[PDB]
Amino acid sequence: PLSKLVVTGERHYTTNDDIRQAILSLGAPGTFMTQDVNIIQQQIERLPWIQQASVRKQWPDELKIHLVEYVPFARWNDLHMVDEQGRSFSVPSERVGKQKLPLLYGPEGSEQDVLEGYRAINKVLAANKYQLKMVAMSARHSWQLALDNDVRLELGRDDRMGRLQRFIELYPMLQQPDKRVSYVDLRYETGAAIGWAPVFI
């Protein structure tokens, strides 16, 4: 004998059963016996992809659960994820991950520090026909990245915004199919250092 579940929200990653198996996680017969501020707590216990969920019971015999998942906006390392807001969460490498989604890397506990950047930098590269593919910050705060093409881009550690406006300027100088820019190192001070890709025959 079980209870029905009136679930509401954009169930994109969440299966009804992802829940029945989360409720059952507590040995207490009588699905409705257990307080809902509790059911929430559990299921809402970030799965870790649910943001906040709401449970309220319809006494007939059905349990009205309304949940709102997390909205992915960029990848954190390689087994993680973050949203426009800046919150961290995960999800199994199962039948879910399937979409071009910006890669952002970095050390532990700097999630916003990083997004902070991309968010403000994206605007610039979005300005032109350059769809940034990734952005990573090292421990001591040393950036780096890549554009549509696999064209690298060292950003360094100190002056990032200024140093960044540069690239936009110097670029219309792609004076070819074989010869492709392989990167632009900006770790200098006078200007940048263009570099090409070692092709193979």
Short mmCIF file of C-alpha atoms in Angstrom, two decimals:
data_model
loop_
_atom_site.label_atom_id
_atom_site.label_comp_id
_atom_site.label_asym_id
_atom_site.label_seq_id
_atom_site.Cartn_x
_atom_site.Cartn_y
_atom_site.Cartn_z
CA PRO A 1 0.00 0.00 0.00
CA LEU A 2 1.54 3.30 -1.11
CA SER A 3 0.71 6.94 -1.68
CA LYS A 4 0.30 9.01 -4.82
CA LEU A 5 2.57 11.91 -5.76
CA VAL A 6 1.32 15.08 -7.37
CA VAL A 7 4.66 16.47 -8.51
CA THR A 8 4.94 19.91 -10.03
CA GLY A 9 7.82 21.85 -11.54
CA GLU A 10 10.29 21.43 -14.42
CA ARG A 11 11.22 17.81 -13.80
CA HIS A 12 14.23 17.74 -16.15
CA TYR A 13 16.65 15.56 -14.20
CA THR A 14 14.21 14.28 -11.58
CA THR A 15 12.30 11.04 -11.93
CA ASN A 16 9.28 10.42 -9.76
CA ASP A 17 11.17 7.35 -8.57
CA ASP A 18 14.29 9.40 -7.80
CA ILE A 19 11.93 10.45 -5.03
CA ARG A 20 9.94 7.43 -3.94
CA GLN A 21 13.46 6.07 -3.36
CA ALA A 22 14.36 9.16 -1.36
CA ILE A 23 11.27 9.03 0.86
CA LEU A 24 11.64 5.32 1.48
CA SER A 25 15.10 6.30 2.79
CA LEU A 26 13.45 6.60 6.21
CA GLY A 27 11.97 3.51 7.86
CA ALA A 28 8.53 4.69 8.95
CA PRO A 29 5.44 2.99 7.50
CA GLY A 30 2.55 5.26 6.58
CA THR A 31 3.91 7.67 3.94
CA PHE A 32 1.78 10.46 5.37
CA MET A 33 2.69 9.81 9.01
CA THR A 34 6.00 11.63 8.44
CA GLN A 35 5.96 15.42 8.72
CA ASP A 36 6.46 17.26 5.44
CA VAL A 37 8.85 19.94 6.68
CA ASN A 38 10.85 16.75 6.92
CA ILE A 39 10.07 15.20 3.56
CA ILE A 40 11.24 18.56 2.09
CA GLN A 41 14.44 18.52 4.10
CA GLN A 42 15.28 15.11 2.70
CA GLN A 43 14.39 15.42 -0.95
CA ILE A 44 15.27 19.16 -0.83
CA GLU A 45 18.56 17.96 0.64
CA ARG A 46 20.27 18.97 -2.54
CA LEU A 47 20.22 15.75 -4.53
CA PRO A 48 22.35 17.83 -4.94
CA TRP A 49 20.52 19.25 -7.89
CA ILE A 50 17.25 20.35 -6.29
CA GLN A 51 17.29 23.93 -5.07
CA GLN A 52 14.25 24.04 -2.76
CA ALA A 53 11.17 21.83 -2.93
CA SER A 54 7.79 22.10 -1.27
CA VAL A 55 5.65 19.37 0.16
CA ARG A 56 2.10 19.60 1.39
CA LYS A 57 -0.31 16.70 1.72
CA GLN A 58 -3.77 16.51 0.21
CA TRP A 59 -5.56 14.39 2.73
CA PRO A 60 -7.56 12.30 0.32
CA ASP A 61 -4.40 10.17 -0.02
CA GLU A 62 -2.07 12.14 -2.32
CA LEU A 63 1.18 13.98 -1.47
CA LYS A 64 1.63 17.25 -3.35
CA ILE A 65 5.33 17.82 -3.97
CA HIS A 66 6.46 20.81 -5.98
CA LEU A 67 10.12 21.08 -6.78
CA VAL A 68 12.38 23.43 -8.70
CA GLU A 69 15.69 22.00 -9.89
CA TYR A 70 18.96 23.90 -10.33
CA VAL A 71 19.64 25.69 -13.63
CA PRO A 72 23.08 24.76 -15.02
CA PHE A 73 25.01 27.65 -16.55
CA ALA A 74 28.63 26.46 -16.66
CA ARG A 75 30.88 23.55 -15.61
CA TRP A 76 33.09 23.82 -12.52
CA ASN A 77 35.83 21.27 -13.04
CA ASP A 78 34.77 18.17 -14.88
CA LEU A 79 32.40 16.38 -12.52
CA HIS A 80 30.60 19.48 -11.22
CA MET A 81 28.30 22.38 -12.26
CA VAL A 82 27.22 25.98 -11.48
CA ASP A 83 24.37 28.42 -12.35
CA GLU A 84 24.00 32.09 -13.30
CA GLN A 85 23.50 32.67 -9.59
CA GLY A 86 26.74 30.95 -8.69
CA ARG A 87 25.67 27.87 -6.74
CA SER A 88 27.46 24.53 -6.94
CA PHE A 89 25.71 21.22 -7.60
CA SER A 90 26.13 17.96 -9.42
CA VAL A 91 24.31 15.22 -11.32
CA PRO A 92 25.28 11.74 -12.66
CA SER A 93 27.11 11.37 -15.95
CA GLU A 94 23.92 9.55 -16.99
CA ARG A 95 21.33 10.53 -19.60
CA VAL A 96 21.49 14.22 -18.78
CA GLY A 97 24.64 15.98 -19.99
CA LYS A 98 24.01 16.90 -23.62
CA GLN A 99 24.55 20.56 -24.55
CA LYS A 100 27.36 23.03 -25.34
CA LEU A 101 28.02 24.46 -21.90
CA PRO A 102 30.95 26.80 -20.93
CA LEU A 103 33.79 25.26 -19.00
CA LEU A 104 35.16 27.09 -15.96
CA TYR A 105 37.94 25.53 -13.85
CA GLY A 106 39.76 26.50 -10.66
CA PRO A 107 40.70 25.55 -7.04
CA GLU A 108 38.25 24.55 -4.27
CA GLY A 109 36.07 27.28 -2.79
CA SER A 110 36.37 30.04 -5.42
CA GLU A 111 33.23 29.23 -7.44
CA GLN A 112 31.88 32.77 -7.43
CA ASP A 113 35.33 34.38 -7.67
CA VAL A 114 35.54 32.61 -11.05
CA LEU A 115 31.99 33.09 -12.35
CA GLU A 116 32.41 36.71 -11.31
CA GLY A 117 35.04 36.85 -14.02
CA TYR A 118 33.46 34.96 -16.90
CA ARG A 119 30.20 36.84 -16.36
CA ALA A 120 32.00 40.19 -16.77
CA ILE A 121 34.38 38.95 -19.48
CA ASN A 122 31.81 37.11 -21.54
CA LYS A 123 30.20 40.43 -22.41
CA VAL A 124 33.39 41.46 -24.25
CA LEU A 125 34.03 38.33 -26.33
CA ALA A 126 30.26 38.04 -26.92
CA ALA A 127 30.52 41.50 -28.38
CA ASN A 128 32.49 40.03 -31.31
CA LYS A 129 32.20 36.64 -33.12
CA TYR A 130 34.25 34.96 -30.37
CA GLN A 131 32.27 32.32 -28.41
CA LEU A 132 34.52 31.68 -25.38
CA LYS A 133 34.87 27.95 -24.77
CA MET A 134 36.48 27.96 -21.33
CA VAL A 135 38.05 29.92 -18.44
CA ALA A 136 40.29 28.64 -15.64
CA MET A 137 41.96 30.24 -12.57
CA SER A 138 44.85 28.62 -10.65
CA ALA A 139 45.46 28.72 -6.90
CA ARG A 140 47.52 31.88 -6.89
CA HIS A 141 44.99 33.42 -9.30
CA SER A 142 46.50 32.71 -12.73
CA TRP A 143 43.95 32.79 -15.55
CA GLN A 144 43.94 31.26 -19.03
CA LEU A 145 41.20 30.38 -21.56
CA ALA A 146 40.15 29.54 -25.15
CA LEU A 147 37.88 30.85 -27.96
CA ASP A 148 35.66 29.26 -30.59
CA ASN A 149 38.71 27.92 -32.30
CA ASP A 150 41.01 26.15 -29.84
CA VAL A 151 42.98 29.39 -29.81
CA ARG A 152 44.48 29.62 -26.30
CA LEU A 153 44.84 32.90 -24.41
CA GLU A 154 47.08 33.36 -21.34
CA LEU A 155 45.71 36.07 -18.98
CA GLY A 156 48.17 35.82 -16.18
CA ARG A 157 47.62 37.09 -12.66
CA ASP A 158 47.64 40.89 -12.33
CA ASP A 159 46.04 43.25 -14.89
CA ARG A 160 43.14 41.30 -16.41
CA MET A 161 40.50 43.77 -17.66
CA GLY A 162 42.93 46.14 -19.33
CA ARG A 163 45.11 43.32 -20.62
CA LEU A 164 41.88 41.81 -21.95
CA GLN A 165 40.61 44.85 -23.93
CA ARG A 166 43.86 44.48 -25.87
CA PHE A 167 43.07 41.23 -27.71
CA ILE A 168 39.85 42.73 -29.12
CA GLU A 169 41.97 45.45 -30.72
CA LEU A 170 44.85 43.44 -32.15
CA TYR A 171 43.30 40.57 -34.16
CA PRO A 172 42.11 41.58 -37.65
CA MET A 173 45.67 40.50 -38.61
CA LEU A 174 44.90 36.88 -39.57
CA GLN A 175 46.69 37.31 -42.89
CA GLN A 176 44.61 31.10 -43.98
CA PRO A 177 43.46 27.39 -43.91
CA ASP A 178 46.78 25.79 -42.98
CA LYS A 179 48.07 28.60 -40.76
CA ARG A 180 45.86 29.10 -37.68
CA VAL A 181 46.63 31.15 -34.59
CA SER A 182 47.45 28.75 -31.81
CA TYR A 183 47.34 31.29 -29.01
CA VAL A 184 48.00 34.83 -27.81
CA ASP A 185 50.20 35.19 -24.73
CA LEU A 186 49.55 38.49 -22.94
CA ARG A 187 51.74 37.81 -19.92
CA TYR A 188 53.90 40.73 -21.17
CA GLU A 189 53.53 44.49 -20.69
CA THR A 190 54.38 46.24 -23.98
CA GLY A 191 52.00 44.07 -26.03
CA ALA A 192 51.00 40.47 -26.86
CA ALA A 193 52.80 37.49 -28.47
CA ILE A 194 50.94 35.69 -31.27
CA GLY A 195 51.67 31.99 -31.85
CA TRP A 196 50.83 29.36 -34.48
CA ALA A 197 49.81 25.72 -34.61
CA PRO A 198 52.35 23.01 -35.56
CA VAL A 199 50.46 21.06 -38.29
CA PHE A 200 51.18 17.48 -39.31
CA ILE A 201 51.70 15.69 -42.68
#
